[PDB]
């Protein structure tokens, strides 16, 4: 990770009001198996 | 129509009525719930967006 310093301003206030206790990601994939791009 | 009142932050509240703004004279005013006092006079401050 880079060293530095930058806030994060607010971009999303939701009211929901769910309980939330695990979650995942999502990634988009390509058909050539497949190829997927280096990130990290 | 019926109103259900349940644990969440009843977004369907309804209208309010706004008046025209003065400046440049002590008086009293409403700023969606922030009640104060004073005068208001054109500003410099470089507020950002949020
Ligand atoms: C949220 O989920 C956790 C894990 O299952 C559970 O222990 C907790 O009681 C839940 N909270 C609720 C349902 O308010």
Same mark, same amino acid.
């Given at each position: 990770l880079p060293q530095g310093f930058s806030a994060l301003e607010p971009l999303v206030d939701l009211p929901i009001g769910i309980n939330i206790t695990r979650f995942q990601t999502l990634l988009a994939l390509h058909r050539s198996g497949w190829t997927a791009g280096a990130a990290a | 129509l019926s109103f259900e009142l349940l644990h @969440?932050? @009843?977004?369907?509240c309804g209208p309010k009525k706004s008046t025209n703004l003065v400046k440049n004279k002590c008086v009293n005013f409403n700023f969606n719930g922030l009640k104060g006092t004073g005068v208001l006079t054109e500003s410099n401050k470089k507020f950002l967006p949020f």
């Open positions: - | @969440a932050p @009843a977004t369907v």
